[PDB]
Amino acid sequence: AIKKYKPTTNGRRHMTSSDFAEITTSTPEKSLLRPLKKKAGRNNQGKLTVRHHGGGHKRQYRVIDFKRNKDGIPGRVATIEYDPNRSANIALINYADGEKRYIIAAKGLEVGQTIYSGAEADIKVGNALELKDIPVGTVIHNIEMKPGKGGQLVRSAGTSAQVLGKEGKYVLIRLNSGEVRMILATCRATIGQVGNEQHELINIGKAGRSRWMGKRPTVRGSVMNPNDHPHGGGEGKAPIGRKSPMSPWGKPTLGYKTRKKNNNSDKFIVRRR
Amino acid sequence: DARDIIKRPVVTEESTSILDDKKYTFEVDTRATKTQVKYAIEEIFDVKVAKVNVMNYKGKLKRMGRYAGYTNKRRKAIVTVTADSKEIQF
Amino acid sequence: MKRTYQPSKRKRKKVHGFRTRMSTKNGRRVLASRRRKGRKVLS
RNA sequence: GUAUGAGUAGCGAAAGAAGGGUGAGAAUCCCUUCCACCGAAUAUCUAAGGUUUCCUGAGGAAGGCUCGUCCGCUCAGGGUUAGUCGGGACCUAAGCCGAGGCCGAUAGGCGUAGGCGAUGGACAACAGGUAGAGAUUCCUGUACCAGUGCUAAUUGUUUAACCGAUGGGGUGACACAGAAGGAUAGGGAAUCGCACGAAUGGAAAUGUGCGUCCAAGCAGUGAGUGUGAGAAGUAGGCAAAUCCGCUUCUUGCGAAGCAUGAGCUGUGAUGGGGAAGCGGAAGUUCCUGAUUUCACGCUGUCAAGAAAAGCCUCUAGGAAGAGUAGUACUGCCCGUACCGCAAACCGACACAGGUAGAUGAGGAGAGAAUCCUAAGGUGAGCGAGAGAACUCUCGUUAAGGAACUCGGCAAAAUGACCCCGUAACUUCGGGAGAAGGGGUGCUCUAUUAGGGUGCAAGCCCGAGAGAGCCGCAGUGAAUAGGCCCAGGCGACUGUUUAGCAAAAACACAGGUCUCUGCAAAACCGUAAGGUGACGUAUAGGGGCUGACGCCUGCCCGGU
Ligand SMILES: [Mg+2]
Ligand SMILES: [Mg+2]
Ligand SMILES: [Mg+2]
Ligand SMILES: [Mg+2]
Ligand SMILES: [Mg+2]
Ligand SMILES: [Mg+2]
Ligand SMILES: [Mg+2]
Ligand SMILES: [Mg+2]
Ligand SMILES: [Mg+2]
Ligand SMILES: [Mg+2]
Ligand SMILES: [Mg+2]
Ligand SMILES: [Mg+2]
Ligand SMILES: [Mg+2]
Ligand SMILES: [Mg+2]
Ligand SMILES: [Mg+2]
Ligand SMILES: [Mg+2]
Ligand SMILES: [Mg+2]
Ligand SMILES: [Mg+2]
Ligand SMILES: [Mg+2]
Ligand SMILES: [Mg+2]
Ligand SMILES: [Mg+2]
Ligand SMILES: [Mg+2]
Ligand SMILES: [Mg+2]
Ligand SMILES: [Mg+2]
Ligand SMILES: [Mg+2]
Ligand SMILES: [Mg+2]
Ligand SMILES: [Mg+2]
Ligand SMILES: [Mg+2]
Ligand SMILES: [Mg+2]
Ligand SMILES: [Mg+2]
Ligand SMILES: [Mg+2]
Ligand SMILES: [Mg+2]
Ligand SMILES: [Mg+2]
Ligand SMILES: [Mg+2]
Ligand SMILES: [Mg+2]
Ligand SMILES: [Mg+2]
Ligand SMILES: [Mg+2]
Ligand SMILES: [Mg+2]
Ligand SMILES: [Mg+2]
Ligand SMILES: [Mg+2]
Ligand SMILES: [Mg+2]
Ligand SMILES: [Mg+2]
Ligand SMILES: [Mg+2]
């Protein structure tokens, strides 16, 4: 659920949060943790190449398998946990061997359920199969581009996709953005929907919370000088005195398309978003 | 190179005062360790060394008219011998 | 008043020392120039 | 090089006085007494930085904003001692270098294995003494860590004592806020000890002054805080595992057991420290009580909070010697002087500026505020004497009370604690300490009524009431909101032109448009390689608007 705050301060007036009712434990799995360091949008050369990044709470990386390789061995859902590195929650799986893993928590995943991987798996939320064993019309997530590489598409909280049909070596999928795409039939996917679907209703409330999440302020191009932006200059407030609005580097930025014109995957895309 | 590890004794008021407690002050070259000093002393003087302490001294800045320089660096060792041992005359 | 010079032995050695000059072609060029002029202190 | 201004400006925040001494010479150097200043510092440690400025004996050309017999100045001799402290021989972070490698007119750029790199992790010593200069370093007592030989017993020999990974696993190993406890440090009263017992009206004791202890180690204990155990079996842990992980059974409980733990007690101590006169007295009981420690222990929250070594265990392996007790011996390199809120560091100066951390007493007090003091430290490197204008920093003013001025600028006024009382409007939180009124000292009832502590003795805290007393005045000093009405702008906290502008400007949470299917778009770079992102359309980049409420109309001819 979404928890609202009483207006005891001007900073808490419109602020909403999550109640974390799905989180069953607050202690991560020590052997699956790796260190993360902030890069703040800096390069090999140490130069700022992406703006508005830097200076949040420190985090620690949790290793997650997007591959789902362990076929045949049953796995039990042990914990549902908070992950600082993504918008979804994660689930800890105990395998009957004695091996522990982290996966993306799907909608309707509960502690105590059992999940499988492979061809003999059933079509049930949390199982991973190959795209040619998944019937038409089912909602999937964690789709992989290349076989054996790991899920790449539809991984953020609340997202989902459907199977639309076969053509033999490929399968038609409708992605979360509405685009229809062709994927190899030997690529894997997980049945269900990603499970933190209320994430988009949260109202940040303060500038400080944004600074906590690692975001630096953004300055409009109109209040700069002419040597910094194509929109800078003028006496008082000024309109966009150009044929089109511009980016800080030239390059029209309202309706102008940026996908490469001679791009190699244009033969696997049936309908554009 | 026992005679190279030990250069000369040190004769001041403090060293002369501690001479009566079976402690002898020497100037040693600037690369020798405590153990080397101990074995050089035992070979040169035929005593039984109980302990060695060492310290380093920087050179002092001096002037003699339009010309300024430094004196030499020094390494100074105090050697104390066992109670049942002979003494060094100085 | 905080002034511009705030000394540090290590920082001085790491930015202007002999081994920092010897690590680049332009630093060795600086050393060669200072040797040609005849200065007593290089780096 | 030398004049003029000119014996003029200045002599860099501050309390001194007298008596002795030294000397050729004294406001200025030394000693004594009295007075004054700081005291969450102007006291004590200690990093950085400086580099001999440290001590002793001589000196007075120059330096010292005056003088100088003096000096951080000149000359000559001295002075810094470590198995345990801080660093290396131990570990790693950001970052840097980088065999082969990839990329590129040259030069070179990037990067793997590997390696450096603390501001962090691990790691064994305490208490006294030291009169020119060093002290957890020297010396005196009493220890600990790692090793070595020599003795004396014990035990083992390839179904193999014992050792054991450069490998597996566990630990190491981590945020922020809140509250209540235990203990100790600290503070204070009695008691006890030593001395005095008094100048001017009084006091031989309800008089005054000073003091009323001691480690590490070793042995015991301990407020407590976490806490489930046993047995079988193994698609996993690159091989193996008796170790871990997982599963199933029996067993289950504020009762134990196990791991941790501040402190306390005995020894250390026939020692040390210590007044009164070499000598060396007393060292008890009670109250108060942490900003320290138990301890990130408990509870709560979202923004979800290093690594590696080390240590322990497991096998793979190595193996005929091994441990045990006692003794004696072994333990390297670098730093160590002195200044360190400052005359020794950064500011050209013996410069009203700046400079990380630890400690930081009493009365009154919520307090590290405020005023006066303790321990400790200072009297500030030009003076004396007159008491004009004018300038500066201060204190009071009759009657009036903004008439001043661009403008109440500046100044004056309010201010603590307790009680009563409190408006429009509102997003229901606020507005609000709104506004406006009243009270406040001391004595007796009174070692109170009642509380805390204690076995008691006793010690600490302590209202309501009555009766009185005195001043012009009772938070009698210092420190401690002025308030109200109405309008523009920007919702708000925040940011900005170092050195003329702090804002109505920027940011902001929210809104909307647009691009992007992942070798994503976008951005840096010739490229390789990167950021985006160890992310995946509830995500990421760009444009405009700027909380919230009601809304955002017509035009696609032109670009
Ligand atoms: Mg980083
Ligand atoms: Mg840049
Ligand atoms: Mg941005
Ligand atoms: Mg913009
Ligand atoms: Mg497209
Ligand atoms: Mg030695
Ligand atoms: Mg030295
Ligand atoms: Mg020395
Ligand atoms: Mg060159
Ligand atoms: Mg002149
Ligand atoms: Mg005098
Ligand atoms: Mg000198
Ligand atoms: Mg002078
Ligand atoms: Mg002068
Ligand atoms: Mg004289
Ligand atoms: Mg001198
Ligand atoms: Mg050491
Ligand atoms: Mg090393
Ligand atoms: Mg240690
Ligand atoms: Mg032995
Ligand atoms: Mg380890
Ligand atoms: Mg007393
Ligand atoms: Mg087991
Ligand atoms: Mg005394
Ligand atoms: Mg006490
Ligand atoms: Mg505390
Ligand atoms: Mg060595
Ligand atoms: Mg040494
Ligand atoms: Mg040394
Ligand atoms: Mg000092
Ligand atoms: Mg007060
Ligand atoms: Mg004052
Ligand atoms: Mg005093
Ligand atoms: Mg009166
Ligand atoms: Mg008064
Ligand atoms: Mg600004
Ligand atoms: Mg809002
Ligand atoms: Mg936007
Ligand atoms: Mg990444
Ligand atoms: Mg967007
Ligand atoms: Mg933008
Ligand atoms: Mg516009
Ligand atoms: Mg509103």
Tab-separated table of N, CA and C in Angstrom, chain A residues 12-125:
chain	number	residue	atom	x	y	z
A	12	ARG	N	6.663	17.871	4.501
A	12	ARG	CA	5.935	16.613	4.559
A	12	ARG	C	4.524	16.720	4.004
A	13	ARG	N	4.173	17.849	3.392
A	13	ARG	CA	2.772	18.144	3.113
A	13	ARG	C	2.191	17.219	2.049
A	14	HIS	N	2.884	17.054	0.926
A	14	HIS	CA	2.380	16.247	-0.179
A	14	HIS	C	3.130	14.934	-0.343
A	15	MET	N	3.899	14.529	0.656
A	15	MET	CA	4.836	13.422	0.536
A	15	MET	C	4.156	12.093	0.838
A	16	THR	N	4.397	11.094	-0.007
A	16	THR	CA	3.884	9.746	0.197
A	16	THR	C	5.027	8.750	0.092
A	17	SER	N	4.834	7.580	0.695
A	17	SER	CA	5.875	6.567	0.757
A	17	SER	C	5.240	5.194	0.597
A	18	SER	N	6.076	4.167	0.600
A	18	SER	CA	5.640	2.781	0.601
A	18	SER	C	5.712	2.224	2.013
A	19	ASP	N	4.795	1.317	2.335
A	19	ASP	CA	4.769	0.738	3.670
A	19	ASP	C	5.577	-0.548	3.786
A	20	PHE	N	6.129	-1.050	2.682
A	20	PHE	CA	6.994	-2.230	2.685
A	20	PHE	C	6.312	-3.426	3.340
A	21	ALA	N	5.033	-3.621	3.024
A	21	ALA	CA	4.292	-4.738	3.593
A	21	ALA	C	4.694	-6.072	2.981
A	22	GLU	N	5.328	-6.057	1.812
A	22	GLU	CA	5.757	-7.279	1.151
A	22	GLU	C	7.113	-7.775	1.632
A	23	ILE	N	7.883	-6.936	2.316
A	23	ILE	CA	9.242	-7.275	2.721
A	23	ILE	C	9.182	-8.125	3.981
A	24	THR	N	9.761	-9.324	3.921
A	24	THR	CA	9.682	-10.262	5.030
A	24	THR	C	10.934	-10.294	5.896
A	25	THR	N	12.059	-9.777	5.414
A	25	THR	CA	13.269	-9.711	6.217
A	25	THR	C	14.069	-8.493	5.787
A	26	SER	N	14.952	-8.036	6.674
A	26	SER	CA	15.761	-6.854	6.408
A	26	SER	C	17.255	-7.143	6.454
A	27	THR	N	17.647	-8.408	6.408
A	27	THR	CA	19.057	-8.790	6.446
A	27	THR	C	19.436	-9.491	5.153
A	28	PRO	N	20.290	-8.907	4.319
A	28	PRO	CA	20.670	-9.564	3.065
A	28	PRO	C	21.506	-10.810	3.312
A	29	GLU	N	21.778	-11.523	2.224
A	29	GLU	CA	22.536	-12.769	2.259
A	29	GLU	C	24.011	-12.454	2.048
A	30	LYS	N	24.808	-12.612	3.106
A	30	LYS	CA	26.158	-12.057	3.131
A	30	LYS	C	27.033	-12.583	2.002
A	31	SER	N	26.837	-13.829	1.583
A	31	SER	CA	27.727	-14.406	0.585
A	31	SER	C	27.403	-13.972	-0.835
A	32	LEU	N	26.293	-13.269	-1.051
A	32	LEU	CA	25.899	-12.805	-2.373
A	32	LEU	C	26.012	-11.292	-2.514
A	33	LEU	N	26.823	-10.650	-1.681
A	33	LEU	CA	27.015	-9.208	-1.701
A	33	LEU	C	28.357	-8.862	-2.327
A	34	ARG	N	28.379	-7.792	-3.106
A	34	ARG	CA	29.577	-7.250	-3.727
A	34	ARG	C	29.624	-5.752	-3.488
A	35	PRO	N	30.809	-5.153	-3.507
A	35	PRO	CA	30.901	-3.701	-3.310
A	35	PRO	C	30.537	-2.903	-4.554
A	36	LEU	N	29.876	-1.770	-4.332
A	36	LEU	CA	29.568	-0.800	-5.374
A	36	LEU	C	30.141	0.555	-4.994
A	37	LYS	N	30.755	1.233	-5.954
A	37	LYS	CA	31.256	2.584	-5.760
A	37	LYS	C	30.554	3.541	-6.713
A	38	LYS	N	30.351	4.772	-6.258
A	38	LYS	CA	29.693	5.766	-7.089
A	38	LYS	C	30.631	6.252	-8.183
A	39	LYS	N	30.076	6.461	-9.371
A	39	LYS	CA	30.842	6.986	-10.486
A	39	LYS	C	30.452	8.403	-10.865
A	40	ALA	N	29.268	8.860	-10.456
A	40	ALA	CA	28.845	10.256	-10.573
A	40	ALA	C	28.877	10.760	-12.011
A	41	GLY	N	28.670	9.872	-12.976
A	41	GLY	CA	28.708	10.277	-14.362
A	41	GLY	C	30.072	10.629	-14.904
A	42	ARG	N	31.145	10.089	-14.331
A	42	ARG	CA	32.506	10.338	-14.782
A	42	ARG	C	33.035	9.146	-15.575
A	43	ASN	N	34.098	9.390	-16.328
A	43	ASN	CA	34.572	8.578	-17.443
A	43	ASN	C	35.886	7.864	-17.111
A	44	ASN	N	36.436	7.161	-18.113
A	44	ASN	CA	37.844	6.760	-18.076
A	44	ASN	C	38.742	7.953	-17.840
A	45	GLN	N	38.456	9.037	-18.535
A	45	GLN	CA	39.263	10.231	-18.491
A	45	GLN	C	38.964	11.081	-17.276
A	46	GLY	N	37.997	10.678	-16.458
A	46	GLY	CA	37.619	11.421	-15.286
A	46	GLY	C	36.734	12.607	-15.551
A	47	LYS	N	36.164	12.709	-16.742
A	47	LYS	CA	35.372	13.854	-17.149
A	47	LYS	C	33.890	13.551	-17.008
A	48	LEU	N	33.121	14.578	-16.679
A	48	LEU	CA	31.679	14.433	-16.559
A	48	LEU	C	31.063	14.273	-17.943
A	49	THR	N	30.433	13.127	-18.188
A	49	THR	CA	29.816	12.846	-19.475
A	49	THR	C	28.304	12.711	-19.413
A	50	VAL	N	27.730	12.510	-18.233
A	50	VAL	CA	26.286	12.500	-18.036
A	50	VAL	C	25.976	13.396	-16.849
A	51	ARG	N	25.023	14.304	-17.022
A	51	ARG	CA	24.739	15.319	-16.024
A	51	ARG	C	23.750	14.819	-14.977
A	52	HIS	N	23.783	15.483	-13.818
A	52	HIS	CA	22.800	15.346	-12.736
A	52	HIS	C	22.928	14.026	-11.977
A	53	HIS	N	24.153	13.548	-11.793
A	53	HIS	CA	24.411	12.320	-11.054
A	53	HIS	C	25.416	12.592	-9.949
A	54	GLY	N	25.184	12.021	-8.775
A	54	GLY	CA	26.203	12.060	-7.748
A	54	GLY	C	25.741	12.283	-6.327
A	55	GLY	N	26.331	11.542	-5.396
A	55	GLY	CA	26.260	11.843	-3.981
A	55	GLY	C	25.056	11.360	-3.204
A	56	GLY	N	24.696	10.086	-3.325
A	56	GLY	CA	23.583	9.531	-2.592
A	56	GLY	C	24.016	8.691	-1.405
A	57	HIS	N	23.054	7.957	-0.864
A	57	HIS	CA	23.352	6.941	0.133
A	57	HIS	C	24.182	5.839	-0.507
A	58	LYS	N	25.114	5.268	0.249
A	58	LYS	CA	25.926	4.199	-0.311
A	58	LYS	C	25.147	2.895	-0.303
A	59	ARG	N	25.365	2.091	-1.332
A	59	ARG	CA	24.652	0.845	-1.520
A	59	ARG	C	25.646	-0.291	-1.670
A	60	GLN	N	25.116	-1.505	-1.654
A	60	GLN	CA	25.927	-2.692	-1.841
A	60	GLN	C	25.214	-3.604	-2.821
A	61	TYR	N	25.948	-4.092	-3.813
A	61	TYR	CA	25.349	-4.850	-4.900
A	61	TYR	C	24.941	-6.247	-4.451
A	62	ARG	N	23.764	-6.679	-4.888
A	62	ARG	CA	23.271	-8.030	-4.667
A	62	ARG	C	23.305	-8.787	-5.983
A	63	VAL	N	23.972	-9.934	-5.995
A	63	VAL	CA	24.116	-10.718	-7.216
A	63	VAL	C	22.810	-11.440	-7.509
A	64	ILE	N	22.285	-11.229	-8.707
A	64	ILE	CA	21.014	-11.786	-9.147
A	64	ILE	C	21.271	-12.588	-10.409
A	65	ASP	N	20.653	-13.761	-10.521
A	65	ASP	CA	20.732	-14.497	-11.775
A	65	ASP	C	19.535	-14.172	-12.659
A	66	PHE	N	19.825	-13.625	-13.822
A	66	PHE	CA	18.831	-13.450	-14.854
A	66	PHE	C	18.841	-14.598	-15.846
A	67	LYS	N	19.686	-15.603	-15.622
A	67	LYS	CA	19.843	-16.720	-16.541
A	67	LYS	C	18.921	-17.882	-16.218
A	68	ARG	N	18.745	-18.199	-14.935
A	68	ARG	CA	17.860	-19.275	-14.487
A	68	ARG	C	18.264	-20.612	-15.113
A	69	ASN	N	19.467	-21.056	-14.751
A	69	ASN	CA	20.113	-22.222	-15.342
A	69	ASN	C	19.806	-23.526	-14.624
A	70	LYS	N	19.544	-23.483	-13.325
A	70	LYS	CA	19.434	-24.699	-12.527
A	70	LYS	C	18.147	-25.423	-12.888
A	71	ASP	N	18.245	-26.384	-13.801
A	71	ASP	CA	17.084	-27.087	-14.327
A	71	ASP	C	16.834	-28.363	-13.540
A	72	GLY	N	15.568	-28.625	-13.248
A	72	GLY	CA	15.148	-29.845	-12.585
A	72	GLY	C	15.102	-29.794	-11.078
A	73	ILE	N	16.047	-29.100	-10.462
A	73	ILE	CA	16.104	-29.025	-9.001
A	73	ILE	C	15.037	-28.050	-8.516
A	74	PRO	N	14.182	-28.446	-7.578
A	74	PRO	CA	13.190	-27.511	-7.044
A	74	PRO	C	13.824	-26.450	-6.162
A	75	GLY	N	13.213	-25.282	-6.158
A	75	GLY	CA	13.683	-24.180	-5.335
A	75	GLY	C	12.558	-23.589	-4.519
A	76	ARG	N	12.843	-23.342	-3.249
A	76	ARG	CA	11.867	-22.810	-2.311
A	76	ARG	C	12.082	-21.321	-2.086
A	77	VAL	N	10.986	-20.568	-2.081
A	77	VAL	CA	11.027	-19.132	-1.824
A	77	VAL	C	11.216	-18.924	-0.326
A	78	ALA	N	12.359	-18.361	0.058
A	78	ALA	CA	12.721	-18.182	1.456
A	78	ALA	C	12.404	-16.789	1.976
A	79	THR	N	12.873	-15.749	1.293
A	79	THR	CA	12.676	-14.378	1.735
A	79	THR	C	12.293	-13.510	0.551
A	80	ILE	N	11.595	-12.420	0.843
A	80	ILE	CA	11.390	-11.328	-0.099
A	80	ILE	C	12.030	-10.083	0.499
A	81	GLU	N	12.920	-9.453	-0.260
A	81	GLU	CA	13.884	-8.512	0.279
A	81	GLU	C	13.915	-7.228	-0.529
A	82	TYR	N	14.360	-6.174	0.147
A	82	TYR	CA	14.563	-4.868	-0.457
A	82	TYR	C	15.905	-4.830	-1.174
A	83	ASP	N	15.908	-4.287	-2.384
A	83	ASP	CA	17.116	-4.107	-3.171
A	83	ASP	C	17.279	-2.624	-3.468
A	84	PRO	N	18.404	-2.001	-3.115
A	84	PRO	CA	18.583	-0.581	-3.425
A	84	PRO	C	18.952	-0.296	-4.867
A	85	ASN	N	19.252	-1.311	-5.664
A	85	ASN	CA	19.813	-1.122	-6.990
A	85	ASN	C	18.778	-1.180	-8.097
A	86	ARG	N	17.520	-1.446	-7.773
A	86	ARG	CA	16.472	-1.562	-8.772
A	86	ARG	C	15.153	-1.195	-8.119
A	87	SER	N	14.141	-0.959	-8.950
A	87	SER	CA	12.840	-0.557	-8.436
A	87	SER	C	11.993	-1.727	-7.956
A	88	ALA	N	12.353	-2.958	-8.300
A	88	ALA	CA	11.622	-4.130	-7.855
A	88	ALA	C	12.264	-4.733	-6.608
A	89	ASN	N	11.522	-5.619	-5.953
A	89	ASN	CA	12.039	-6.379	-4.826
A	89	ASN	C	12.628	-7.693	-5.317
A	90	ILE	N	13.468	-8.303	-4.487
A	90	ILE	CA	14.105	-9.550	-4.889
A	90	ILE	C	13.626	-10.671	-3.982
A	91	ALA	N	13.831	-11.898	-4.438
A	91	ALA	CA	13.443	-13.088	-3.700
A	91	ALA	C	14.644	-14.002	-3.571
A	92	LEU	N	14.824	-14.564	-2.381
A	92	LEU	CA	15.890	-15.519	-2.115
A	92	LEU	C	15.340	-16.931	-2.229
A	93	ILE	N	16.004	-17.748	-3.032
A	93	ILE	CA	15.575	-19.099	-3.353
A	93	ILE	C	16.579	-20.065	-2.752
A	94	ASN	N	16.079	-21.027	-1.982
A	94	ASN	CA	16.867	-22.145	-1.483
A	94	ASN	C	16.618	-23.341	-2.388
A	95	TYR	N	17.672	-23.859	-2.994
A	95	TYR	CA	17.545	-25.056	-3.802
A	95	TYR	C	17.735	-26.294	-2.940
A	96	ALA	N	17.153	-27.403	-3.396
A	96	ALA	CA	17.216	-28.640	-2.635
A	96	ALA	C	18.642	-29.138	-2.478
A	97	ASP	N	19.569	-28.616	-3.278
A	97	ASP	CA	20.971	-28.990	-3.159
A	97	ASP	C	21.592	-28.406	-1.904
A	98	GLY	N	21.201	-27.198	-1.553
A	98	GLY	CA	21.934	-26.381	-0.631
A	98	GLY	C	22.579	-25.177	-1.264
A	99	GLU	N	22.078	-24.714	-2.404
A	99	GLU	CA	22.588	-23.523	-3.060
A	99	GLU	C	21.519	-22.441	-3.069
A	100	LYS	N	21.929	-21.217	-2.760
A	100	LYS	CA	21.026	-20.089	-2.600
A	100	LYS	C	21.215	-19.094	-3.733
A	101	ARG	N	20.116	-18.496	-4.185
A	101	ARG	CA	20.189	-17.525	-5.269
A	101	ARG	C	19.178	-16.408	-5.051
A	102	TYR	N	19.350	-15.326	-5.805
A	102	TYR	CA	18.438	-14.190	-5.815
A	102	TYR	C	17.803	-14.079	-7.190
A	103	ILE	N	16.489	-13.872	-7.232
A	103	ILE	CA	15.790	-13.614	-8.484
A	103	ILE	C	14.875	-12.411	-8.297
A	104	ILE	N	14.339	-11.922	-9.413
A	104	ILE	CA	13.358	-10.847	-9.369
A	104	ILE	C	12.055	-11.388	-8.804
A	105	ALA	N	11.493	-10.685	-7.830
A	105	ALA	CA	10.232	-11.099	-7.234
A	105	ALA	C	9.085	-10.742	-8.169
A	106	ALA	N	8.310	-11.743	-8.563
A	106	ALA	CA	7.161	-11.545	-9.428
A	106	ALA	C	5.925	-11.197	-8.604
A	107	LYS	N	4.878	-10.761	-9.294
A	107	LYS	CA	3.597	-10.544	-8.640
A	107	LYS	C	3.010	-11.866	-8.180
A	108	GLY	N	2.584	-11.916	-6.924
A	108	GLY	CA	2.002	-13.124	-6.391
A	108	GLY	C	2.989	-14.158	-5.919
A	109	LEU	N	4.269	-13.819	-5.842
A	109	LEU	CA	5.261	-14.725	-5.288
A	109	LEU	C	5.242	-14.631	-3.770
A	110	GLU	N	5.175	-15.779	-3.107
A	110	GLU	CA	5.029	-15.839	-1.665
A	110	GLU	C	6.099	-16.745	-1.081
A	111	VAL	N	6.405	-16.522	0.194
A	111	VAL	CA	7.362	-17.370	0.890
A	111	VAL	C	6.752	-18.748	1.087
A	112	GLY	N	7.497	-19.782	0.718
A	112	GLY	CA	7.044	-21.149	0.847
A	112	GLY	C	6.666	-21.821	-0.452
A	113	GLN	N	6.525	-21.076	-1.542
A	113	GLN	CA	6.217	-21.683	-2.824
A	113	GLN	C	7.471	-22.289	-3.445
A	114	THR	N	7.263	-23.128	-4.455
A	114	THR	CA	8.341	-23.832	-5.134
A	114	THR	C	8.331	-23.468	-6.610
A	115	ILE	N	9.508	-23.184	-7.158
A	115	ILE	CA	9.644	-22.786	-8.552
A	115	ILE	C	10.606	-23.734	-9.249
A	116	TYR	N	10.402	-23.907	-10.549
A	116	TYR	CA	11.200	-24.806	-11.367
A	116	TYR	C	11.709	-24.079	-12.600
A	117	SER	N	12.698	-24.683	-13.242
A	117	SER	CA	13.224	-24.189	-14.500
A	117	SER	C	13.418	-25.373	-15.434
A	118	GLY	N	13.244	-25.134	-16.722
A	118	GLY	CA	13.487	-26.146	-17.727
A	118	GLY	C	12.248	-26.453	-18.535
A	119	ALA	N	12.360	-27.495	-19.361
A	119	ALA	CA	11.285	-27.830	-20.287
A	119	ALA	C	10.099	-28.457	-19.567
A	120	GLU	N	10.356	-29.240	-18.524
A	120	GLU	CA	9.292	-29.930	-17.808
A	120	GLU	C	8.593	-29.048	-16.786
A	121	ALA	N	8.980	-27.784	-16.670
A	121	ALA	CA	8.313	-26.879	-15.749
A	121	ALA	C	6.884	-26.607	-16.202
A	122	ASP	N	6.020	-26.334	-15.238
A	122	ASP	CA	4.647	-25.975	-15.536
A	122	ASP	C	4.533	-24.477	-15.787
A	123	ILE	N	3.435	-24.083	-16.423
A	123	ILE	CA	3.192	-22.673	-16.693
A	123	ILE	C	2.605	-22.046	-15.438
A	124	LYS	N	3.479	-21.607	-14.538
A	124	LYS	CA	3.079	-21.063	-13.253
A	124	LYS	C	3.973	-19.874	-12.937
A	125	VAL	N	3.426	-18.921	-12.183
A	125	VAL	CA	4.132	-17.678	-11.896
A	125	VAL	C	5.429	-17.988	-11.166
